[PDB]
Design a protein around this ligand. Structure first.
Ligand SMILES: [Zn+2]
Ligand SMILES: [Zn+2]
Ligand SMILES: [Zn+2]
Ligand SMILES: [Zn+2]
Ligand SMILES: [Zn+2]
Ligand SMILES: [Zn+2]
Lengths: 484, 484
């Protein structure tokens, strides 16, 4: 019927016993001390992220899962660059919800754990699973707030987590279903449901040609799947003329590498090479849901990178919208090609800031793995804003260098103005970033290389194995704070 | 006979002609305007780092090389994290000196260029070449300050550059000559020449065994070359009891990878796998030369990593000095093994700070290349001190993360307390750093992964192709400022 998730903290030195949250304390009282009694009988105390289940304590809650929240006053961890208490809550609540789901319980009430937004994030991110294409599926669990005192915060958590889950769905869906057109249609419907103060333009190939986006076009042509340039507007500012914030995302729905073909092992994960587009578009959907008082534009060039008799050939020179020529030495360095055109187009909006996201390089994965998203930016103010937002969400960012040292290695080009792969194999994420900078003149630009945080195995406790949708929540938080 | 290097700046908008430095202006006057006249006749102005040679202008200087210094007031570049003017001077002066050397001139006087230390660094780092083992050698050039007004600063530059050149020599020398014993003897003689307030102990294998350094010993045994543990003391503090600063360096004189053998291509560069030891030992020699008022201890475990019938075998478990067990899954991840024992020993000195350097991972090279040394530290105060020092020297540092996220991947171990390679291939530099942290309890520790800055092709203009000796000057600067 109905399950209940309650939290308990680690015992502090002067306490005689570990303390329940307010809800746990109230429930124990409701059952005349039976919860504390049974917890004591069960043995060792619950530590952070651990769970234990007690049956039959109340007729309304046949299964009660108690979860360890760790130290009650855990705040910002100076060494980890995140709010520890929030992370403990997300992990603990996710673990509790997965136990409720294993017991095949369709609905669960969740203890706010002193921070309803974090509790909601743990439950909603934790229960998520992409199973539309399977016969065998786990029970669908409906999680709601236990109590009625922390509603806005709980709902805020549901909203943030839902945005990330939308990104996860888009990334996880196989490329034959999640084509450029399909991705555009799903984003279009989600944005329109979020707010009527939106406009969506799924720009066709003819428009792309009119816009002289030769770099983007060169990538798309190898495949039979039609390319599209998704342009979305959210008019949240009270002043329609207020300069917008522009987000740009790499939308390669499937990357085979092209003529510079990839190895077979785990190439299926490349269905998520559109993660950059997924995260920035989902962030905008969420911003619209929150009705943030700001104008935002989202740009996402979308296409496949396939080998064929029409595909990009190593050595080919293409002309970007801005007139710059690019020597395509490696057709698998295609994300930067489509981004060159989208970044150029972004300047036409005279934006306040330009932020792009892309599952750009394997080098980024070798550099930081799934620990944090690499951020390249010409603005310390912007770096700081993204960094502060990440401490709150727990979806960490780490700064990477934008030095001429790297630029020199990409403009040293045999046939053109810029080469699409560096002179050497070193610092691949840095030279890719340098390539992108040659198409940016804006003073507040940030490039997020999310290749290393594309998937999750078990690193983030509250995300099941699969595409991660990171760092969608950090982007939403940045926008929220920016709007305030 | 004697050559002369003079600088000229880029012309500023309201100037009628580009301005010479004070020395260039004085020389032009000495030759009745002949320098300006000929420079004008030669054509286009000289830009940063470019040079032009004029003959017969003065009987004392048959060859005068004018070098472009760029913008006179170039200060700290916010985007590049270095003092630009100093970098322009080092590059320009090095280029000028190389031209003088090509003309086979044995002595040259160098314009201080508004910053004698930077000019001296450009000349001394710029002319350096390891050619002891060649029949054919370029002319030995003796560079001295032009004038007598900037002596202390010029000499400071010579000292800093000489320290780096010592590191370069140690790194460049072939491993059959630069053995553990030889490296120790060369460092010993250099430290003793620098100051009488020093003690050097080239600890033998019996001492290593007595110290129960099983991890270090396991690496050394595969080779026939005797291992040594170099321990150096510089007693510069007025108070002999003042806690020392401790530097630790990885001294693998040659790394074949061991049983987990390396590929053949460019394996010769592994003669520089002792770069960590070279840089920290050279920094200490320089600190002693400067007679900094501080106590410093240098620790450098030295040995070869070779395959044989006695070598480390994948899966073997070894016991570190601190009692922790380590599963040696990959024998090529040997630097962290010898460092575990040296870092443990470092705590016995009750130091103020512990800084280690190591050409540790190929991942670091993939991460940042030769743009900057990766720094992992549990102290933002220490990060800041190293960062500020690097702005001054131009030998840049960049912070990398020390997160439990990475620790989890190395303590998840089948047979022991810690595994010498991570669970996954991602973030190799980060998991290596996490491994090292398991052997550190000190509150002010920094690990410098210098694998990416081991060599120079043409990235640093003032360093000829070969082993770089980076970031020796940043370490010297840190110590200088610390002492003040
Ligand atoms: Zn997909
Ligand atoms: Zn690709
Ligand atoms: Zn791609
Ligand atoms: Zn050597
Ligand atoms: Zn090795
Ligand atoms: Zn090594």
């Amino acid at each position: 019927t109905k399950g209940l998730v309650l939290g308990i903290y680690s015992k502090e030195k002067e306490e005689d016993e570990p303390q329940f949250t307010s809800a746990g304390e109230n429930f124990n009282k409701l059952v005349s001390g039976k919860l504390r009694e049974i917890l004591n009988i069960s043995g060792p105390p619950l530590k952070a992220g651990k769970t234990r289940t007690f049956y039959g304590l109340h007729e309304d809650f046949p299964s009660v899962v108690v979860v360890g929240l760790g130290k009650k006053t855990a705040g910002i961890d100076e060494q980890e660059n995140w709010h520890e208490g929030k992370e403990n809550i997300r992990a603990a609540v996710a673990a509790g919800c997965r136990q409720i789901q294993d017991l095949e319980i369709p609905s669960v009430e969740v203890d706010p754990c002193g921070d309803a937004q974090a509790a909601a994030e743990g439950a909603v991110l934790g229960l998520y699973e992409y199973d539309d294409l399977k016969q065998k599926r786990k029970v669908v669990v409906s999680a709601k707030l236990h109590g009625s005192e922390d509603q806005e915060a709980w709902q805020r958590g549901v909203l943030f987590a839902s945005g990330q889950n939308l990104a996860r769905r888009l990334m996880e869906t196989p490329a034959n279903e999640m084509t450029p057109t399909k991705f555009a249609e799903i984003v279009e419907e989600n944005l329109k449901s979020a707010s009527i103060k939106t406009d969506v333009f799924i720009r066709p190939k003819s428009w792309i040609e009119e816009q002289e986006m030769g770099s983007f076009l060169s990538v798309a042509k190898g495949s039979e799947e039609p390319p599209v340039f998704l342009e979305i507007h959210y008019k949240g500012s009270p002043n329609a003329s207020e300069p917008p914030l522009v987000f740009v995302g790499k939308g390669i729905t499937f990357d085979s590498g092209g003529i510079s073909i990839k190895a077979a092992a785990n190439m299926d994960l490349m269905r998520a090479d559109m993660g950059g587009a997924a995260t920035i578009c989902s962030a905008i959907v969420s911003a619209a849901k929150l009705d943030l008082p700001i104008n935002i534009v989202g740009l996402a060039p979308l296409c496949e990178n396939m080998p064929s008799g029409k595909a990009n050939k190593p050595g080919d020179v293409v002309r970007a919208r801005n007139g710059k020529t690019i020597q395509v030495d490696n057709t698998d360095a295609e994300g930067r090609l489509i981004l060159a055109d989208a970044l150029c187009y972004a300047h036409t909006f005279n934006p306040k800031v330009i932020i792009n996201a892309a599952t750009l390089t394997g080098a980024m994965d070798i550099a930081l793995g799934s620990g944090a998203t690499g951020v390249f930016t010409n603005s310390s103010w912007l770096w700081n804003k993204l960094f502060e937002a990440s401490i709150e969400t727990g979806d960490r960012v780490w700064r990477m260098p934008l030095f001429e040292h790297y630029t020199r290695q990409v403009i040293d080009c045999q046939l053109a103005d810029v080469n699409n792969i560096g002179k050497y194999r070193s610092a691949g994420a840095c030279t890719a970033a340098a390539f992108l900078k040659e198409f940016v003149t804006h003073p507040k630009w940030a490039h997020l290389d999310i290749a290393g945080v594309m998937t999750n195995k078990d690193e983030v406790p509250y995300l099941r194995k699969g595409m991660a949708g990171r760092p969608t929540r950090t982007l939403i938080e940045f926008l929220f704070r920016f709007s305030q």
